[PDB]
Amino acid sequence: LRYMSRDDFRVLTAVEMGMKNHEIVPGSLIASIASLKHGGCNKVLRELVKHKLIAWERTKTVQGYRLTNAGYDYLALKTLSSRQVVESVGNQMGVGKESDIYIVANEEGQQFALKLHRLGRHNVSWLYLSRLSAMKEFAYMKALYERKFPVPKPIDYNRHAVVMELINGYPLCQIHHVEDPASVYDEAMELIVKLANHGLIHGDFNEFNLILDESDHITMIDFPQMVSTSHPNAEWYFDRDVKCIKDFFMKRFSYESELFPTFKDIRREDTLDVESTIPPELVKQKVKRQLTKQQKSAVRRRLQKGANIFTKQRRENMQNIKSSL
Amino acid sequence: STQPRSKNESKEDKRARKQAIKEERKERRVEKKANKLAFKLEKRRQEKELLNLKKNVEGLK
Amino acid sequence: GKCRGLRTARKLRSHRRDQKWHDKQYKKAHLGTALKANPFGGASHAKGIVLEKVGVEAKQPNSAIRKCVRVQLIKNGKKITAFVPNDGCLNFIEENDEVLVAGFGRKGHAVGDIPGVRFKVVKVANVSLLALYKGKKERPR
Amino acid sequence: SLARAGKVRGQTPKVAKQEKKKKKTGRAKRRMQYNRRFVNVVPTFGKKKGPNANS
RNA sequence: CUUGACUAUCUAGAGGAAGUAAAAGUCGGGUUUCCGUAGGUGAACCUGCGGAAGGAUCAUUAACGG
RNA sequence: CAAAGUCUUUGGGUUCCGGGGGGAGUAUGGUUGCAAAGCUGAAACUUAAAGGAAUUGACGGAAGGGCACCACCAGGAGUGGA
């Protein structure tokens, strides 16, 4: 859990600065880009390694620290706490293969759902691929919610985290019986035509990507796989999804279709496939920026001398040599 | 002034147009020197106001 | 290189004196700018009056709070930040008190950990800090 | 914000000093420093032990 | 000693502009390295002009007279 | 590097010039300049270092190389669905 609420923000963000440019980030660089407190961040790092926040690396010459799976996760929740969306943790967790679903609660007590991307090449690239995944998923989630679709409501995105509306139900794959099979079938068939009207094909529109809300309402999740209708094989992915639903309701619920929708409508809706002259006050601002940069560069070099680990290794062997003489 | 010098223009037309650009720049490097002394006087007084802190008004109690 | 004449004395000596001014030590000693800007002003010790207790935050790696005392000297009236030595020696010094201040050791460098502090307290109200810490004397007021 | 004054002096358990027999001074002390270093020599293979060396 | 001119200092000061702790208070990708100069909103940096390397040379190279 | 040699075995004549890094080639004064500027030119203060040559190669987001059914290809059997 999150007890520590000051220095842990600045140090962990400084890791993320080095993670975007380089692999394993040395402890010398950290203190320079976290200039607010000097010297005492090395004991914070020793508290970070107690948790699954950072990992140590001392290979051959490469000495420093890299950010972990769980350590990257804490940074998003710390940002979402400042945006007043997350406060306490709900325990119902659906541990998946591509992502983890965590129930969150705000100041109000209103329960929302949180997605955390767990893509698993070094861990540096893996925690950058999860960054692009959340930004892409939130883009479609905003695009569909605005265009009348029955999707979870987008709230906030932070690096790899996506806060969505809490739609609680069961996935279609583990459903025994539906009270009204025909009305549910026609609802689902409409949604393929709906997407095709907006110039989109789901691609993998199966029973593994559909959730029933009280056996009345079909909910759609997971959107990184989506393709344009400008694609040469546009009608193939359209017909494969139709046949997947046609056979499933005939298999599980024994409902045969009276309606066979094969309409190509592109596009009647929004194309979502794309988805003395200088005043003294300015002189002050400009002189200030110069003076801050001179001090910041000097503080970097003071912090780069922290090597403290190099001095500790050299001292241990000298004591052994003198005693043996 | 951004006028392309046309071929049929003679003396008095060319000569006054050149003298206009000369006077723009003369007014311009006066304005640049003025800023150069404005920044020089503002850096030097902020150097004092920061070096003042090193000596006094920095610490705790 | 060097002129090595027999009548070259005046060239030599004059050159030596001219070059002597680029030596940091000599210039410091002889120009009479450092002897005037020095708050002590050619003094082993000064005596001042305490204005406030100032906890100076230590220079980067060594992270602590160095307990200094902002004296105002008597003999001219310059302000000084002055480090009070051993632990719990700050407690002896009270505001508006006589204090004998001395250099630190390096003639104008901040010594080690403390930034911009050149001076240390030696006596509080005519009794030594070293005695008061070691419980040898009592402090009047 | 933090900053105690002489915390570690006032937290240490005040251990009273032991009463030992007095030290010899001057020429007497030098004598004892001489005979402890050059007179009663105890043989060692390579000499790795110091004078104060506690273990 | 008095009278002015140049100065030097010591000491009172409305107001100005600051800075400093208190308020979580309201909102929110490009670059080889340079040098001198001119311009681009001061500096940086970029560009024009003239310099540098303080920048990583493969290969070919015997006749040439009827 | 045949001078960058003939230097603790240190003196052929002679001119200019450097003395930890910064602040700073900045202020100020003088002077030259139509101007832009040039020459001359500090201190207060700050800092344990700024740096030069060489040497192994932790890491390349290097390029190449080669290796493995816990990699692929050609395949067989599955898991994942009850």
From Swiss-Prot, chain A:
PANTHER family: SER/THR-PROTEIN KINASE RIO2, SERINE_THREONINE-PROTEIN KINASE RIO2. Serine/threonine-protein kinase involved in the final steps of cytoplasmic maturation of the 40S ribosomal subunit. Involved in export of the 40S pre-ribosome particles (pre-40S) from the nucleus to the cytoplasm. Its kinase activity is required for the release of NOB1, PNO1 and LTV1 from the late pre-40S and the processing of 18S-E pre-rRNA to the mature 18S rRNA. Regulates the timing of the metaphase-anaphase transition during mitotic progression, and its phosphorylation, most likely by PLK1, regulates this function. Residues 89-248 form the Protein kinase domain. It comes from Homo sapiens. The active site is at 204 (proton acceptor). GO terms for molecular function: ATP binding; metal ion binding; protein kinase activity; protein serine kinase activity; protein serine/threonine kinase activity. Gene3D superfamilies: Phosphorylase Kinase, domain 1, Transferase(Phosphotransferase) domain 1, Winged helix-like DNA-binding domain superfamily/Winged helix DNA-binding domain. This is Serine/threonine-protein kinase RIO2. Autophosphorylated (in vitro). It comes from the Eukaryota.
UniProtKB/Swiss-Prot annotation, chain B:
The lineage of its organism: Eukaryota, Metazoa, Chordata, Craniata, Vertebrata. Residues 1-34 are annotated as: Disordered. This is Protein LTV1 homolog. The gene is LTV1. It is found in: Cytoplasm. Residues 6-34 have a biased composition (Basic and acidic residues). Belongs to the LTV1 family. Essential for ribosome biogenesis. It is linked to Inflammatory poikiloderma with hair abnormalities and acral keratoses: An autosomal recessive disorder characterized by mottled hyper- and hypopigmentation of the skin, sparse scalp hair and eyelashes, sparse or absent eyebrows, and palmoplantar keratoses. Residues 5-61 form a coiled coil. Expressed in the epidermis. The chain holds residues 414 to 474 of 475 of the full protein.
Curated annotation (Swiss-Prot), chain C:
Hydroxylation at Pro-61 affects translation termination efficiency. Component of the 40S small ribosomal subunit. Part of the small subunit (SSU) processome, composed of more than 70 proteins and the RNA chaperone small nucleolar RNA (snoRNA) U3. GO terms for molecular function: RNA binding; structural constituent of ribosome. Residues 1-19 have a biased composition (Basic residues). This is Small ribosomal subunit protein uS12. Keywords: Acetylation, Cytoplasm, Deafness, Disease variant, Dwarfism, Endoplasmic reticulum, Hydroxylation, Isopeptide bond, Nucleus, Ribonucleoprotein, Ribosomal protein, Ubl conjugation. GO terms for cellular component: cytoplasm; cytosol; cytosolic ribosome; cytosolic small ribosomal subunit; endoplasmic reticulum; membrane; nucleolus; nucleoplasm. GO terms for biological process: cytoplasmic translation; maintenance of translational fidelity; ribosomal small subunit biogenesis; stress granule assembly; translation. Belongs to the universal ribosomal protein uS12 family. It holds the Pfam family Ribosom_S12_S23. The modification 3-hydroxyproline is found at residue 61. It is found in: Cytoplasm, Cytosol; Cytoplasm; Rough endoplasmic reticulum; Nucleus, Nucleolus. Residues 1-25 are annotated as: Disordered. The modification N6-succinyllysine is found at residue 53. Changing residue 66 to K: In BTDD; decreases hydroxylation of the protein; decreases the accuracy of translation; decreases levels of incorporation of the mutant protein into ribosomes and polysomes; patient cells become highly sensitive to oxidative stress. There is a cross-link at residue 36 (Glycyl lysine isopeptide (Lys-Gly) (interchain with G-Cter in SUMO2)). PROSITE patterns: RIBOSOMAL_S12. The modification N6-acetyllysine is found at residue 134.
UniProtKB/Swiss-Prot annotation, chain D:
Residues 19-32 have a biased composition (Basic residues). It is found in: Cytoplasm; Nucleus. It comes from the Eukaryota. Residues 6-32 are annotated as: Disordered. The modification N6-succinyllysine is found at residue 47. Component of the 40S subunit of the ribosome. Component of the 40S subunit of the ribosome. Contributes to the assembly and function of 40S ribosomal subunits. This is Small ribosomal subunit protein eS30. It comes from Homo sapiens (Human).
